[PDB]
Amino acid sequence: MVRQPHSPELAKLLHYAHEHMKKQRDLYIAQDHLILALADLPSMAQVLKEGGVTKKSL
Angle formed at CA 40 by CA 38 and CA 42, multiple of 5 degrees: 95
Question: Measured from the CB atom, is 5 or 30 closer to its own copies?
Answer: 30
The smaller minimum CB distance to its own copies, of residues 6 and 56, is found at: 56
The Cα–Cα gap between 34 and 45 comes to 14
Interface characters, 1-40, with its own copies (x: CB under 8 A): ----------------x--xxxxxxxxxx---x--xx---
Q: Collapse the DSSP code of 49 into the 3-class scheme (helix H, G, I; strand E, B; otherwise coil) and give the result.
A: helix
Positions in the binding site for its own copies (CB under 8 A): 17, 20-29, 33, 36-37, 52-54, 56-58
